[PDB]
Design a binder for this molecule. Sequence first.
Ligand SMILES: OC[C@H]1O[C@H](O[C@H]2[C@H](O)[C@@H](O)[C@@H](O)O[C@@H]2CO)[C@H](O)[C@@H](O)[C@@H]1O
Ligand SMILES: [Cl-]
Ligand SMILES: [Cl-]
Ligand SMILES: [Cl-]
Ligand SMILES: [Cl-]
Ligand SMILES: [Zn+2]
Length: 370
Amino acid sequence: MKIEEGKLVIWINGDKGYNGLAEVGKKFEKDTGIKVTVEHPDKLEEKFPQVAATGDGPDIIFWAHDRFGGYAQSGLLAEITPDKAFQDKLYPFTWDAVRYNGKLIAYPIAVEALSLIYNKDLLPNPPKTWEEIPALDKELKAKGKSALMFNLQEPYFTWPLIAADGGYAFKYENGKYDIKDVGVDNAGAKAGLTFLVDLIKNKHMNADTDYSIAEHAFNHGETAMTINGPWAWSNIDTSKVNYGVTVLPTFKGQPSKPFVGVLSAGINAASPNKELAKEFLENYLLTDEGLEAVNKDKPLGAVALKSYEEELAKDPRIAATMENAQKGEIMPNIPQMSAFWYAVRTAVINAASGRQTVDAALAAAQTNAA
Ligand SMILES: OC[C@H]1O[C@H](O[C@H]2[C@H](O)[C@@H](O)[C@@H](O)O[C@@H]2CO)[C@H](O)[C@@H](O)[C@@H]1O
Ligand SMILES: [Cl-]
Ligand SMILES: [Cl-]
Ligand SMILES: [Cl-]
Ligand SMILES: [Cl-]
Ligand SMILES: [Zn+2]
């Protein structure tokens, strides 16, 4: 078989708590005899539609909900069937994220938003504005440090700045997203991307900075700030850097507006193990003990499971996560999101590297997203 009967194969991103998830899998195996194998392929969210379209791939895929409408439209996801009692365990807005064309198509797990993470020893009082960063970098450089480093290769991390002054993905109005109406090339989006490009032009950041570089720099005390999600806190803890997690800086007086993702677990339509996947997700993973196990490996951040979230909310880092989430927007789950992200990734990388002006980059992004 392309997908093996009698076990579960799971995909989750490599920066999440995949070892903790595997532990939940070992508990499952102990109780049921069903082995669970967790993989973390790179770009799994791009690979999934390729392999699932041929009846292959994992039994279960974990990713933010934004990719799931596309998968569902292509018939790659099984309809899930939790009853009302189970539904009541999770916050209503998380279920909204995973409902597509009249069907629930994934189980919500956690609510993710980026925050500003800062080194308290270098910056006891972190900047409230993006505009403060250039001068702060010049001041820190004289002491052998930089102000800020974050992943410039994934547009997820730059979006909060692009959206701050008015950029948006798809217009939502009167109960629908208008997929012909994109906001990646409005004045606000240009302003935010231009600010980023200027940070690079003025040697405050490097265009080639990626996830690993920014994490390395922050966790080694080479830079005073980074922008990242809750999954990153575990490695910072181990580094012994004294850090805080706070509201993202404003731009032109406007809050940064991160795109909020609901990490969700979908079941492959081609899986011969759908009932076992349901048992694993409902009875083992989406439980206090299951999420705690994953969280202990890499923090989930705010979780969809009310009972556990009530405990996590007491953590000031989680409060900061929710504050940033409230200033941002939940991502659409519509199929056009794949095109949107391709468009914006291309624009940010080309603008940052100087291959395109901001105006040309975002003009192309508008065409490509719509
Ligand atoms: O950067 C584009 C990318 O953004 C989001 O992916 C996030 C993901 O949601 C987070 O859980 C975390 O792993 O960071 C990822 C970015 O590297 C979108 O969900 C994704 O579809 C999109 O390609
Ligand atoms: Cl990266
Ligand atoms: Cl080093
Ligand atoms: Cl529970
Ligand atoms: Cl769409
Ligand atoms: Zn280094």
